[PDB]
Assembly symmetry: C3
Amino acid sequence: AMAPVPVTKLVCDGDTYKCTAYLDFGDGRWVAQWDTNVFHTG
Amino acid sequence: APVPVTKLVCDGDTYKCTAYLDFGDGRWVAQWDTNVFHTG
Amino acid sequence: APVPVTKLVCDGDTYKCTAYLDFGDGRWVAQWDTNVFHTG
Ligand SMILES: CC(=O)N[C@@H]1[C@@H](O)[C@H](O[C@@H]2O[C@H](CO)[C@@H](O[C@@H]3O[C@H](CO[C@H]4O[C@H](CO)[C@@H](O)[C@H](O)[C@@H]4O[C@@H]4O[C@H](CO)[C@@H](O)[C@H](O)[C@H]4NC(C)=O)[C@@H](O)[C@H](O)[C@@H]3O)[C@H](O)[C@H]2NC(C)=O)[C@@H](CO[C@@H]2O[C@@H](C)[C@@H](O)[C@@H](O)[C@@H]2O)O[C@H]1N=[N+]=[N-]
Ligand SMILES: CCCCCC(=O)CC(=O)O
């Protein structure tokens, strides 16, 4: 299965509550993006 | 309980990300639904 | 606003992944629900 492609770089955003995974595919501008919780620990 | 992710992949046909875990035989994964799209 | 990840872990007891973020005092995380399982 060649469909799953590596993630080049993972970032997350506490304003939008999303993480964005840049993908090793095509022109470089495809991303995976999902909803996340974000909070300060301790 | 939390274990390191050794590798992360995402799939634009199934719309999932799969994280390979550093645990046991090396064949455990975490997997979640994701959006996938082209930016710009 | 998107910041880098310094460590990525997942947990098969709590069914979450956690990404420690490079921001502020260093204690901020992103955390989301995931499936976890052994393949094979
Ligand atoms: C002999 C031995 O030590 N064996 C080890 C195993 O015990 C261990 O497996 C984990 O074991 C614990 C019990 O000790 C399990 O915890 C229980 O889980 C049940 C079921 O949980 C599901 O359903 C409940 C209620 O409906 C939900 O709240 C849960 O989230 C979960 O449901 C899942 O939720 C996700 C996220 O939303 C969904 O994607 C998913 O589809 C959904 N699944 C289903 C079927 O609905 C719960 O009722 C009990 O109260 C209790 O919490 C735990 O489930 C089980 N984990 C797994 C992944 O099977 C394994 C794995 O070890 C763990 O994961 C590793 C990656 C690592 O992080 C390790 O540190 C963790 O402890 O290891 C065995 N030994 N080995 N190898
Ligand atoms: C922690 C590794 C367990 C590996 C699972 C096996 O199938 C046994 C081996 O070949 O060693």
